[PDB]
Amino acid sequence: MRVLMTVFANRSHLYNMVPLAWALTTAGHEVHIASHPDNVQAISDSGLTAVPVGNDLNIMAALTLNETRPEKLTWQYIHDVFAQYSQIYEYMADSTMTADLVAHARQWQPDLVIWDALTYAGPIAAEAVGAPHVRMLFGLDQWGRMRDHFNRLTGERAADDRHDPLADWLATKGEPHGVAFTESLVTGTTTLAVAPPWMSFPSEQPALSMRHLPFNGPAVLPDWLREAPSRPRVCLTLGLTLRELNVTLADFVNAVADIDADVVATFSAEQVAEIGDLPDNVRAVDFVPLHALLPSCAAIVHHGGGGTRTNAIRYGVPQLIVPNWLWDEGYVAERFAERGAALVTEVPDLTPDRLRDQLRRLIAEPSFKAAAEQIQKEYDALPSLTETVGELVRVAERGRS
Amino acid sequence: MRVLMTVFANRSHLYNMVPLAWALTTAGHEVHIASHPDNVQAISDSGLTAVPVGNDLNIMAALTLNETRPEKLTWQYIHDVFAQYSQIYEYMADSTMTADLVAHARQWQPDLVIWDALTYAGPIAAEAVGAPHVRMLFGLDQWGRMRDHFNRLTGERAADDRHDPLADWLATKGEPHGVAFTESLVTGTTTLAVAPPWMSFPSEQPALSMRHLPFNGPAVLPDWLREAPSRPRVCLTLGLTLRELNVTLADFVNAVADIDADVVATFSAEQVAEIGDLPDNVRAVDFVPLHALLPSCAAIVHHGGGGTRTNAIRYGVPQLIVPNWLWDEGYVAERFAERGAALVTEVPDLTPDRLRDQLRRLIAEPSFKAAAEQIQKEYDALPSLTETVGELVRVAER
Ligand SMILES: [Mg+2]
Numbered sequence: 001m002r003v004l005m006t007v008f009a010n011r012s013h014l015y016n017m018v019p020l021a022w023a024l025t026t027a028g029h030e031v032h033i034a035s036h037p038d039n040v041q042a043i044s045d046s047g048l049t050a051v052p053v054g055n056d057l058n059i060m061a062a063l064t065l066n067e068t069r070p071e072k073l074t075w076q077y078i079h080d081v082f083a084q085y086s087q088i089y090e091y092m093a094d095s096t097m098t099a100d101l102v103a104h105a106r107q108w109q110p111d112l113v114i115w116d117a118l119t120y121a122g123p124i125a126a127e128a129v130g131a132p133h134v135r136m137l138f139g140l141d142q143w144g145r146m147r148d149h150f151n152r153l154t155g156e157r158a159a160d161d162r163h164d165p166l167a168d169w170l171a172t173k174g175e176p177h178g179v180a181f182t183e184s185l186v187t188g189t190t191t192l193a194v195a196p197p198w199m200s201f202p203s204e205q206p207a208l209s210m211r212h213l214p215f216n217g218p219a220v221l222p223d224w225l226r227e228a229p230s231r232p233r234v235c236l237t238l239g240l241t242l243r244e245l246n247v248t249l250a251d252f253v254n255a256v257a258d259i260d261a262d263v264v265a266t267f268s269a270e271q272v273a274e275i276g277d278l279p280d281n282v283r284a285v286d287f288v289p290l291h292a293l294l295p296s297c298a299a300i301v302h303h304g305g306g307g308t309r310t311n312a313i314r315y316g317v318p319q320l321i322v323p324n325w326l327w328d329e330g331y332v333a334e335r336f337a338e339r340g341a342a343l344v345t346e347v348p349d350l351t352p353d354r355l356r357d358q359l360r361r362l363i364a365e366p367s368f369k370a371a372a373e374q375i376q377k378e379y380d381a382l383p384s385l386t387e388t389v390g391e392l393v394r395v396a397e398r399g400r401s
Numbered sequence: 402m403r404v405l406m407t408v409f410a411n412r413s414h415l416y417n418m419v420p421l422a423w424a425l426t427t428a429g430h431e432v433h434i435a436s437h438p439d440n441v442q443a444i445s446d447s448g449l450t451a452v453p454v455g456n457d458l459n460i461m462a463a464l465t466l467n468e469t470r471p472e473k474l475t476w477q478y479i480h481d482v483f484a485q486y487s488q489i490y491e492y493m494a495d496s497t498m499t500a501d502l503v504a505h506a507r508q509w510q511p512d513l514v515i516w517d518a519l520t521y522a523g524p525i526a527a528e529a530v531g532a533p534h535v536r537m538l539f540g541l542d543q544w545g546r547m548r549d550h551f552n553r554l555t556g557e558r559a560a561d562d563r564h565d566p567l568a569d570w571l572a573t574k575g576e577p578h579g580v581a582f583t584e585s586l587v588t589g590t591t592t593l594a595v596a597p598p599w600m601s602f603p604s605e606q607p608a609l610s611m612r613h614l615p616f617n618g619p620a621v622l623p624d625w626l627r628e629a630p631s632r633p634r635v636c637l638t639l640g641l642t643l644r645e646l647n648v649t650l651a652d653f654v655n656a657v658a659d660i661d662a663d664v665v666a667t668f669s670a671e672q673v674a675e676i677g678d679l680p681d682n683v684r685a686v687d688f689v690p691l692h693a694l695l696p697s698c699a700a701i702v703h704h705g706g707g708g709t710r711t712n713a714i715r716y717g718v719p720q721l722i723v724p725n726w727l728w729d730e731g732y733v734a735e736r737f738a739e740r741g742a743a744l745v746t747e748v749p750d751l752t753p754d755r756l757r758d759q760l761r762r763l764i765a766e767p768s769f770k771a772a773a774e775q776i777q778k779e780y781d782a783l784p785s786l787t788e789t790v791g792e793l794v795r796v797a798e799r
Contacts, residue, residue: 019427026424026786044619047448049690051622107627213427218445221452226508289450385427386787
C-alpha cells in the first residue's frame with residue numbers, strides 16, 4: 001500500500017517517525033515522507049524518500065498546552081489555547097504546504113496518511129481522497145486531553161454558546177480542497193501513541209500503542225566507546241538547561257562529577273569554554289549515540305524529553321530528570337519518580353549539591369535500577385513495530401469499501 | 402540480538418544491505434555496520450550506525466569469474482581464477498581491516514555476523530567469536546558456482562594434486578586470530594540471495610531467498626515528477642556506457658528519443674553540454690530516484706546492474722539492457738530476454754538505430770509488459786524482509 005507520512009520541518013519530530021517509516025518500508029509498502037524543503041536533508045540522512053511540500057519553514061530563526069491544574073482548565077481557557085495554537089499550527093503547515101500536500105495525495109492517491117500530531121496538513125490531504133489517517137504522537141497527548149475536556153464542556157453550554165476555534169480553523173483550512181470539518185480532522189481516524197500506556201493520559205478515544213523505537217539520527221561509534229567499560233558510567237545531557245542558571249556552570253559540573261563513576265557529558269564548544277578545566281572523570285563530547293552509550297550507564301541526567309527518556313526506558317537506565325516544559329516533561333518526570341525509576345529536580349530547585357546527591361543515590365541504591373528494569377520489561381512487551389504495521393494495514397483496509 | 406554487518410567501502414555494496422539492516426533494526430535488534438573509514442559517511446547517511454575498521458580503501462583508484470562455457474571450466478582455469486581473486490578480495494578487506502573487525506567482535510559479542518559476499522573479514526570475525534554468519538549476495542553467486550565445480554573437480558584429483566588457493570588464503574587470513582580453515586569460511590554458515598530463484602545459478606547449497614528491496618541512497622521526488630504523465634515515459638540510464646562509447650552522444654540521444662514517448666535521461670552536466678541542444682521530448686537530469694520514476698515508465702534502458710534491475714522487477718517494467726559484463730549482467734540480461742521481459746544489445750552491437758528500434762518494440766508490443774508483470778508477480782511471492790529477519794534469528798539461535 002502507499003503511505004503518505006507528513007511532518008513539519010523539525011528533525012526531532014522527523015526522527016520520532018523514522019523507525020515506523022522504515023518498518024512500513026521493509027514490510028513492502030511504498031512510503032513517502034512529505035515535509036518542507038528544509039527538512040529534506042534530514043529525511044535523506046534517515047534513509048527515506050522525501051517529498052518536499054510548501055516553502056522552507058525555518059522554525060528555528062499565559063496559554064499553554066501542558067496546563068493540568070483543574071481550576072485553570074475552564075471552557076474559556078481551552079478555547080483560547082485553541083485559538084492561539086490554531087494560528088501557530090497554521091504557520092507550521094501552510095496553505096502552500098497544505099495545497100502541495102493535497103495535490104500529491106490526489107496524484108499519488110495514498111492508502112494511509114500518517115501525520116505528526118502537530119502537522120495539520122496531514123488530515124486535510126487524507127480527506128481529499130477518503131484515506132483513513134493516523135495521528136502520530138511524539139509524547140503525551142496534551143492536545144487530545146484538552147480536546148476531550150473542551151468537547152465535554154461544550155456539550156453542556158447553551159447552543160448559541162459553543163464557539164469552537166478548531167472547527168473554524170480546520171473548516172477554513174479544508175475549504176479550498178472541498179474538505180468539510182469533522183472531528184476526525186482534529187484527532188485522526190485514529191491515534192498512534194509513542195509513550196507507554198502506564199504513563200499516558202486517559203483518552204475518550206482509543207490509541208494504538210507501540211514499543212517505540214527512539215531513532216537517534218546518524219551515528220559513528222567513537223573509539224573510546226569501543227573499549228571495555230572501565231567502571232560505572234553516567235550520561236549527562238543537561239547542557240541546554242545548565243547555561244540558563246554566581247552559581248557557575250563549572251560549579252554544576254564539579255558537583256555532578258563528584259560521584260563514583262565516569263561521566264560522559266554533552267557540551268557546546270561555547271560551554272566547554274565557559275566551564276574551563278574539566279574534572280578528571282568527565283569526558284566532554286559534542287554528541288553521543290545513546291543506544292551505544294546507555295547499555296553501559298548506571299544513570300542518565302537529562303531534561304525529560306521523549307527521545308532521551310525512551311532510550312532510558314529501552315535500556316533500563318535510572319534517570320535524573322531536570323524537566324523542561326516544552327511539552328510533557330514535568331508530568332512524565334513525576335510518573336517515573338512514582339515508580340521509583342527516577343529522581344526529579346525542578347528547574348527552580350536546581351543546586352549543584354542537589355543534583356550530585358540525587359545522582360549519588362541512583363548510583364548507590366539498587367532500587368532505582370530494579371524499577372528502571374521493570375519499566376524496560378513492560379516496554380519490551382509492547383507491540384513490536386511489525387505488529388504495528390499489521391494494525392496500520394488493518395486501519396487502511398477497515399478504512400475501505 | 403546484536404548483529405554485526407560488514408561491507409567493504411563501496412556504496413553500491415552497502416546499499417545492497419541497507420534495507421535488511423533496517424528490517425533488523427525495527428525488529429529491535431542492535432545493528433552495527435563495519436566498513437573502511439571512507440565508507441562511514443554513506444552508512445551514517447543511510448540512517449545507520451557505522452563502525453570504522455581498517456584504513457581507507459579508496460577502491461575507485463583472461464581469468465574471469467563470469468566464465469560459463471563448460472569447455473573453459475577446467476580445474477586449472479578455476480584454480481587460477483581463485484588464485485587471482487583471492488588477492489583482489491584480500492586487498493578489499495585487509496589484515497588491518499580484518500584485525501579491527503575481529504577486535505570489535507571480541508568486545509561487542511555479536512550473536513550473528515552478516516557479511517557482504519566480497520568482504521572476507523566477516524567470517525573470520527564470526528569464527529573468532531564462534532558466532533554464525535550469513536554471506537549476503539549482491540547479485541548471482543558467481544563465486545559459489547565456480548566453487549561447486551572446483552570442489553568436485555578437486556575431489557577427483559590425485560590427493561597430492563589438490564591445491565586450493567582459497568583454503569591457503571583463508572587459513573593464512575584466520576591464523577592470527579586462531580581461526581582454522583573450514584569451508585564455511587568460503588561460503589558462510591548460510592547464504593542470503595537477493596536475485597529471484599528463476600534467474601539464479603544451480604547451487605549445491607540452499608540459500609535463503611528474499612523479496613529484495615533496492616536502495617540507492619538519498620531520494621527526493623522532484624516537482625516535475627508529480628504530474629500524471631501524458632503518454633509512455635522511458636527512463637534512459639546509460640550515461641556511463643555511452644561515455645566509454647562517427648556516432649556522437651547526440652546521435653544516440655537523438656535516435657533513442659525518436660519514439661512516441663517522453664525520455665527521462667540521466668546525464669552528467671559535461672554530457673548535457675557536449676550533446677548540445679536536446680530534443681523536445683527528452684529531459685536531462687543528474688539523478689532521479691528510480692523507485693519513484695518507474696511506476697510511470699513503459700521501459701527502462703540500463704546496463705543490467707542489480708539495483709536498477711531489482712527496480713524493474715518490482716515495478717514490472719520492460720528493459721532494454723546493454724550489459725556491462727562486470728559481475729553477472731550478461732547472464733541476467735539473457736534470463737530476462739528468455740522470459741520475454743527485455744531486449745538485449747551487446748556493446749559491440751550498439752548503434753543509435755538499434756537502441757531506437759528495440760525501444761519502440763518495448764513500448765508497442767504488449768508481450769513485454771505482460772512478461773515484466775509476471776516477473777513482478779513472482780517477486781511479490783518471495784519471503785518479505787520480515788520473514789527473512791525470522792530466518793536470521795533461527796540462524797543466530799543455531
Ligand atoms: Mg541460456
